[PDB]
Design a protein around this motif. Structure first.
Motif, PDB file in Angstrom:
ATOM      1  N   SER A 157       0.859  -1.172   0.000  1.00 48.48           N
ATOM      2  CA  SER A 157       0.000   0.000   0.000  1.00 48.48           C
ATOM      3  C   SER A 157       0.893   1.218   0.000  1.00 48.48           C
ATOM      4  CB  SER A 157      -0.930  -0.014   1.203  1.00 48.48           C
ATOM      5  OG  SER A 157      -1.745  -1.170   1.150  1.00 48.48           O
ATOM      6  N   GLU A 158       2.148   0.993   0.359  1.00 52.64           N
ATOM      7  CA  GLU A 158       3.195   1.933   0.047  1.00 52.64           C
ATOM      8  C   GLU A 158       4.446   1.176  -0.336  1.00 52.64           C
ATOM      9  OE1 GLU A 158       4.683   4.580   3.173  1.00 52.64           O
ATOM     10  OE2 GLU A 158       6.097   5.468   1.720  1.00 52.64           O
ATOM     11  N   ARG A 159       5.165   1.717  -1.311  1.00 55.14           N
ATOM     12  CA  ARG A 159       6.466   1.199  -1.674  1.00 55.14           C
ATOM     13  C   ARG A 159       7.420   2.370  -1.715  1.00 55.14           C
ATOM     14  NH1 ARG A 159       8.351  -1.610  -7.418  1.00 55.14           N
ATOM     15  NH2 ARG A 159       9.825  -3.085  -6.459  1.00 55.14           N
ATOM     16  N   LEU A 160       8.282   2.461  -0.716  1.00 55.00           N
ATOM     17  CA  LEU A 160       9.224   3.565  -0.665  1.00 55.00           C
ATOM     18  C   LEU A 160      10.557   3.046  -1.157  1.00 55.00           C
ATOM     19  CD1 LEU A 160       9.571   6.572   0.261  1.00 55.00           C
ATOM     20  CD2 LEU A 160      10.520   5.613   2.393  1.00 55.00           C
ATOM     21  N   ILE A 161      11.143   3.751  -2.122  1.00 62.65           N
ATOM     22  CA  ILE A 161      12.460   3.398  -2.640  1.00 62.65           C
ATOM     23  C   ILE A 161      13.514   4.344  -2.074  1.00 62.65           C
ATOM     24  CG2 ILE A 161      13.938   3.305  -4.672  1.00 62.65           C
ATOM     25  CD1 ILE A 161      10.246   2.366  -4.804  1.00 62.65           C
ATOM     26  N   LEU A 162      14.623   3.772  -1.619  1.00 63.73           N
ATOM     27  CA  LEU A 162      15.624   4.512  -0.868  1.00 63.73           C
ATOM     28  C   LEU A 162      17.042   4.145  -1.268  1.00 63.73           C
ATOM     29  CD1 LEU A 162      13.922   4.171   2.622  1.00 63.73           C
ATOM     30  CD2 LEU A 162      13.985   6.191   1.167  1.00 63.73           C
TER      31      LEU A 162
ATOM     32  N   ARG B 169      17.074  13.506   5.111  1.00 61.36           N
ATOM     33  CA  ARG B 169      15.639  13.477   4.882  1.00 61.36           C
ATOM     34  C   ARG B 169      15.006  12.394   5.740  1.00 61.36           C
ATOM     35  NH1 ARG B 169      17.714  11.631  -0.331  1.00 61.36           N
ATOM     36  NH2 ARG B 169      15.631  11.174  -1.161  1.00 61.36           N
ATOM     37  N   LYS B 170      13.828  12.683   6.283  1.00 60.43           N
ATOM     38  CA  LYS B 170      13.067  11.684   7.015  1.00 60.43           C
ATOM     39  C   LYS B 170      11.934  11.147   6.154  1.00 60.43           C
ATOM     40  CE  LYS B 170      13.913  13.032  11.852  1.00 60.43           C
ATOM     41  NZ  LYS B 170      13.308  12.893  13.213  1.00 60.43           N
ATOM     42  N   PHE B 171      11.398  10.002   6.558  1.00 60.55           N
ATOM     43  CA  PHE B 171      10.319   9.359   5.831  1.00 60.55           C
ATOM     44  C   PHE B 171       9.399   8.702   6.817  1.00 60.55           C
ATOM     45  CE2 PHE B 171      14.019   9.745   3.294  1.00 60.55           C
ATOM     46  CZ  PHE B 171      13.579  10.102   2.036  1.00 60.55           C
ATOM     47  N   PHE B 172       8.104   8.933   6.641  1.00 57.11           N
ATOM     48  CA  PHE B 172       7.110   8.383   7.551  1.00 57.11           C
ATOM     49  C   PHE B 172       6.127   7.521   6.802  1.00 57.11           C
ATOM     50  CE2 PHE B 172       8.686  12.483   8.541  1.00 57.11           C
ATOM     51  CZ  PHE B 172       8.930  12.516   9.911  1.00 57.11           C
ATOM     52  N   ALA B 173       5.590   6.521   7.489  1.00 58.03           N
ATOM     53  CA  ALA B 173       4.658   5.600   6.863  1.00 58.03           C
ATOM     54  C   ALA B 173       3.515   6.410   6.285  1.00 58.03           C
ATOM     55  CB  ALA B 173       4.135   4.602   7.881  1.00 58.03           C
ATOM     56  N   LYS B 174       3.287   6.303   4.981  1.00 56.19           N
ATOM     57  CA  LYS B 174       2.108   6.914   4.377  1.00 56.19           C
ATOM     58  C   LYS B 174       0.855   6.169   4.826  1.00 56.19           C
ATOM     59  CE  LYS B 174       4.628   8.793   0.459  1.00 56.19           C
ATOM     60  NZ  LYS B 174       4.663  10.169   1.071  1.00 56.19           N
ATOM     61  N   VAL B 175       1.044   4.918   5.231  1.00 54.55           N
ATOM     62  CA  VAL B 175      -0.062   4.046   5.588  1.00 54.55           C
ATOM     63  C   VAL B 175       0.325   3.144   6.774  1.00 54.55           C
ATOM     64  CG1 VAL B 175       0.623   2.191   4.008  1.00 54.55           C
ATOM     65  CG2 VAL B 175      -1.776   2.455   4.628  1.00 54.55           C
ATOM     66  N   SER B 176      -0.672   2.656   7.499  1.00 56.50           N
ATOM     67  CA  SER B 176      -0.452   1.663   8.549  1.00 56.50           C
ATOM     68  C   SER B 176      -0.466   0.243   7.976  1.00 56.50           C
ATOM     69  CB  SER B 176      -1.529   1.778   9.642  1.00 56.50           C
ATOM     70  OG  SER B 176      -1.587   3.096  10.170  1.00 56.50           O
ATOM     71  N   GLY B 177       0.371  -0.631   8.530  1.00 52.70           N
ATOM     72  CA  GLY B 177       0.418  -2.016   8.099  1.00 52.70           C
ATOM     73  C   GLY B 177       1.720  -2.707   8.455  1.00 52.70           C
ATOM     74  N   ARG B 178       1.995  -3.831   7.795  1.00 50.34           N
ATOM     75  CA  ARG B 178       3.209  -4.596   8.048  1.00 50.34           C
ATOM     76  C   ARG B 178       4.277  -4.205   7.041  1.00 50.34           C
ATOM     77  NH1 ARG B 178       1.403  -8.636  11.083  1.00 50.34           N
ATOM     78  NH2 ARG B 178       1.748 -10.678  10.082  1.00 50.34           N
ATOM     79  N   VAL B 179       5.500  -3.988   7.512  1.00 50.59           N
ATOM     80  CA  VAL B 179       6.567  -3.640   6.591  1.00 50.59           C
ATOM     81  C   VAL B 179       7.269  -4.870   6.058  1.00 50.59           C
ATOM     82  CG1 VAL B 179       6.961  -1.576   7.987  1.00 50.59           C
ATOM     83  CG2 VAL B 179       8.582  -3.502   8.085  1.00 50.59           C
ATOM     84  N   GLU B 180       7.742  -4.743   4.830  1.00 53.99           N
ATOM     85  CA  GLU B 180       8.667  -5.692   4.249  1.00 53.99           C
ATOM     86  C   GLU B 180       9.741  -4.841   3.580  1.00 53.99           C
ATOM     87  OE1 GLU B 180       7.851  -7.327   0.517  1.00 53.99           O
ATOM     88  OE2 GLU B 180       9.918  -8.077   0.583  1.00 53.99           O
ATOM     89  N   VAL B 181      10.999  -5.093   3.922  1.00 57.88           N
ATOM     90  CA  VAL B 181      12.107  -4.360   3.325  1.00 57.88           C
ATOM     91  C   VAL B 181      12.944  -5.221   2.378  1.00 57.88           C
ATOM     92  CG1 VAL B 181      12.727  -4.359   5.759  1.00 57.88           C
ATOM     93  CG2 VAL B 181      14.494  -3.955   4.016  1.00 57.88           C
ATOM     94  N   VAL B 182      13.317  -4.641   1.242  1.00 53.23           N
ATOM     95  CA  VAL B 182      14.289  -5.271   0.362  1.00 53.23           C
ATOM     96  C   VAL B 182      15.622  -4.557   0.550  1.00 53.23           C
ATOM     97  CG1 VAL B 182      12.334  -5.282  -1.231  1.00 53.23           C
ATOM     98  CG2 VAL B 182      14.414  -4.032  -1.851  1.00 53.23           C
ATOM     99  N   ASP B 183      16.650  -5.322   0.901  1.00 55.01           N
ATOM    100  CA  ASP B 183      17.971  -4.758   1.139  1.00 55.01           C
ATOM    101  C   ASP B 183      18.949  -5.191   0.046  1.00 55.01           C
ATOM    102  OD1 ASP B 183      19.799  -4.256   4.277  1.00 55.01           O
ATOM    103  OD2 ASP B 183      20.155  -3.480   2.250  1.00 55.01           O
ATOM    104  N   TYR B 184      19.138  -4.324  -0.940  1.00 54.25           N
ATOM    105  CA  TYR B 184      20.090  -4.584  -2.006  1.00 54.25           C
ATOM    106  C   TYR B 184      21.264  -3.620  -1.918  1.00 54.25           C
ATOM    107  CZ  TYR B 184      16.263  -7.255  -4.083  1.00 54.25           C
ATOM    108  OH  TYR B 184      15.250  -8.157  -4.311  1.00 54.25           O
ATOM    109  N   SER B 185      22.258  -3.855  -2.767  1.00 55.82           N
ATOM    110  CA  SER B 185      23.411  -2.977  -2.893  1.00 55.82           C
ATOM    111  C   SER B 185      23.029  -1.804  -3.787  1.00 55.82           C
ATOM    112  CB  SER B 185      24.577  -3.739  -3.527  1.00 55.82           C
ATOM    113  OG  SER B 185      24.653  -5.066  -3.034  1.00 55.82           O
TER     114      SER B 185
ATOM    115  N   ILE C 133       4.872  -1.398   2.649  1.00 58.24           N
ATOM    116  CA  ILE C 133       3.928  -1.545   3.753  1.00 58.24           C
ATOM    117  C   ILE C 133       2.622  -2.153   3.269  1.00 58.24           C
ATOM    118  CG2 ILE C 133       2.596  -0.378   5.520  1.00 58.24           C
ATOM    119  CD1 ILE C 133       4.828   1.854   5.410  1.00 58.24           C
ATOM    120  N   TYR C 134       2.232  -3.269   3.882  1.00 56.34           N
ATOM    121  CA  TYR C 134       1.038  -4.005   3.460  1.00 56.34           C
ATOM    122  C   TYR C 134      -0.092  -3.863   4.455  1.00 56.34           C
ATOM    123  CZ  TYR C 134       4.404  -6.272   0.387  1.00 56.34           C
ATOM    124  OH  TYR C 134       5.401  -6.518  -0.526  1.00 56.34           O
ATOM    125  N   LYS C 135      -1.305  -3.729   3.932  1.00 56.50           N
ATOM    126  CA  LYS C 135      -2.492  -3.643   4.763  1.00 56.50           C
ATOM    127  C   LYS C 135      -2.660  -4.943   5.533  1.00 56.50           C
ATOM    128  CE  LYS C 135      -7.522  -3.022   4.700  1.00 56.50           C
ATOM    129  NZ  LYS C 135      -8.748  -3.493   3.979  1.00 56.50           N
TER     130      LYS C 135
END
Length: 341
Positions: free
Chosen positions: A50-55, A198-214, A221-223
């Motif tokens: 429900s959100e996908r934040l790229i960092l 820069r800071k970043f806040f959940a646009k939505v409530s739910g469970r996070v899943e992070v992808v950690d690449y190089s 964030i999933y509902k």
């Protein structure tokens, strides 16, 4: 001072907690009841983010896989930008960053289209692109790789030029662009912050899943859904005497306590532990088949026996029935939390 189960009608738990909390307020008796818990289990309820934040790969994450977050929580932080070498700014240029994820997955293609080349109208996160399709309103800057946009961001291209003639290029996210620090002709010094974090806040409530690449980090964030583990139970922390008893017993919708004979029974430590852990009130650490007896070895329900009921591979999840309070209780959990006995 101790935990007790208060009985209500299935599905009225929340009203009883409110009522009790109100009575405490309208009454000024604040020494009887402490914490009140309605054990819920938070399950996944989303087929996709429900959100996908790229960092950036150097983004400090304040969250982690499996974690549950609320719509305002800080979930990540991008460091400040620092001049790698001393020199003078010889160019500052408005530039759109378009990051394309290709079907060959894995790693991304970043483009920088000078604003002066007109960004194609119709470009958004989620937009499919194919090779030969221009990204700029004119010529130049054509897409070399079929894929989708997963990020588009306005930036400033800052070129710092060293005294001997070499150059460092930085891309400043527009929202942190600082006109007085960053302008053609200005001297920058090594170590100088060219832009803040820069800071970043959940646009939505739910469970996070992070992808950690190089190549990049992501927060997805999933509902989620919530399911009351024990209909008709309210766990209330309280001293137990005549007054406390009558105080809570006479609350609307309170039907009674779980009790053997007389004065209600304070929950056995062993049986309360999952309640507490689920409540975030305690900080805690192959070939399975349906009907398999397993032991929970981790989590809220650690140390409990159980029976596999539902299995969900390609998610490594299990729905197992556990007995607490003599109640058959389905709990969801990871295969990494059980043993086959």
């Amino acid at each position: 001072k101790k935990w007790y189960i208060v009985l209500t009608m299935s599905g009225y738990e929340e009203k009883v907690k409110e009522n009790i909390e109100k009575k405490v307020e309208a009454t000024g008796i604040k020494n009887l009841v402490g914490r009140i818990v309605i054990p819920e289990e938070v399950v996944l309820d989303a087929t996709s983010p429900s959100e996908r934040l790229i960092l950036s790969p150097k983004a400090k994450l304040h969250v982690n896989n499996g974690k549950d977050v609320n719509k305002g929580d800080l979930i990540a932080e991008e460091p400040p930008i620092y001049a790698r070498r001393s020199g003078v700014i010889v160019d500052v240029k408005n530039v759109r960053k378009i990051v394309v994820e290709t079907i060959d997955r894995k790693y991304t293609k970043t483009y920088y289209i000078p604003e002066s080349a007109g960004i194609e109208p119709g470009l958004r996160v989620g937009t499919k692109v194919k090779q030969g399709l221009p990204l700029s309103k004119n010529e130049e800057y054509i897409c070399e790789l079929d894929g989708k946009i997963v990020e588009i961001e306005r930036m400033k291209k800052v070129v710092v030029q060293t005294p001997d003639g070499e150059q460092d290029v930085y891309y400043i996210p527009l929202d942190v662009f600082d006109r007085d620090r960053i302008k053609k002709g200005k001297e920058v010094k090594q170590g100088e912050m060219l832009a803040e974090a820069r800071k970043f806040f959940a646009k939505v409530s739910g469970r996070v899943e992070v992808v950690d690449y190089s190549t990049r980090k992501e927060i997805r964030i999933y509902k989620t859904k919530r399911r009351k583990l024990f209909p008709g139970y309210v766990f209330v922390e309280m001293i137990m005497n005549d007054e406390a008893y009558n105080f809570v017993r006479s609350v609307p919708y309170v039907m009674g306590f779980v009790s053997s004979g007389g004065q209600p029974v304070p929950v056995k430590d062993r049986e309360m532990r999952p309640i507490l852990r689920l409540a975030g009130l305690e900080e805690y650490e192959l070939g399975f088949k349906v009907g398999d007896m397993v032991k929970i070895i981790s989590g809220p329900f650690e140390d409990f026996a159980g029976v596999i009921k539902e299995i969900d591979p390609e998610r490594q999840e299990l729905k197992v029935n556990v007995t607490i309070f003599g109640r058959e209780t389905p709990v969801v959990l990871h295969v990494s939390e059980v043993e086959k006995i």
